[PDB]
Amino acid sequence: MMKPAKPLPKEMEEFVQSSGENGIVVFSLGSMISNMSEESANMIASALAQIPQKVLWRFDGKKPNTLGSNTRLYKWLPQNDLLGHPKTKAFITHGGTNGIYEAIYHGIPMVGIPLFADQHDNIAHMKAKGAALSVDIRTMSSRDLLNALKSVINDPVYKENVMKSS
Numbered sequence: 001m002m003k004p005a006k007p008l009p010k011e012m013e014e015f016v017q018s019s020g021e022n023g024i025v026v027f028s029l030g031s032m033i034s035n036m037s038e039e040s041a042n043m044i045a046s047a048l049a050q051i052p053q054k055v056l057w058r059f060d061g062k063k064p065n066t067l068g069s070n071t072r073l074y075k076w077l078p079q080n081d082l083l084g085h086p087k088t089k090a091f092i093t094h095g096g097t098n099g100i101y102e103a104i105y106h107g108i109p110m111v112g113i114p115l116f117a118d119q120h121d122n123i124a125h126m127k128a129k130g131a132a133l134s135v136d137i138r139t140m141s142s143r144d145l146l147n148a149l150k151s152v153i154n155d156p157v158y159k160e161n162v163m164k165s166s
Contacts, residue, residue: 003105005084012056016087019054025153026108027057027092028079030101034061034153040137043065047145053089053153056082082157083108089153095119101127104165109158111148113137131162 008016016024027048033041041064042102048055049068059073067073082088083106093099095114096166100122103110111124126132133148151156 003080003084003102005106006078008081008085009076010075010079015054015056016082017086019087022052022054023087023089023153024054024056024082024085025051025090025092025149026077026079026082026088027055027059028077028082029058029096030092030093030113033059036137038062038064043137043142044145045071046142047149050146051149051153061074090149092149093121097122104131104162107163109152109162110154111135113144126162126165129161129165131165132160133158140153150164 007013042060045064045066045068048057048071049066053070055071056077057071057073058077059071060075063073080102083091083102088108091103091108091110093110093112095112096119110126112126112132112134114120114123114134123132124132127134133152135148
């Protein structure tokens with residue numbers, strides 16, 4: 001089924017345009033971040049702050065003290081409309097079936113942060129197709145997340161593989 005995107009809210013479009021040639025990263029839903037330690041959100045924020053891309057982070061916890069100026073926090077996000085925007089370079093998700101279906105539709109490579117059995121299996125399957133990398137925030141470091149992000153954002157083979165998956 002086709003999953004077409006519609007225009008973004010104006011203020012959100014303006015932030016997305018300010019990424020210029022770098023493009024953006026969408027970290028969407030991330031619904032378990034608010035139930036984890038403050039240190040988890042701080043580790044993610046530190047990694048996200050070190051890429052040149054702008055970052056739209058669907059988030060509702062306390063603002064991380066390591067939040068970078070390139071990253072904005074939103075309690076709600078039009079995830080599908082962001083995945084279909086031409087400036088989107090990578091998708092960070094826990095690995096739910098819904099978001100993976102949209103990233104596949106719009107051809108966006110992924111960094112998975114799986115927590116549950118179905119998310120681990122989904123992300124492992126996309127990784128085996130060369131369309132994603134995975135980090136376990138509970139055991140890996142901020143440097144591990146940064147390395148995964150720079151790879152999926154800048155190496156075209158991940159995008160090319162997720163498009164071969166249609």
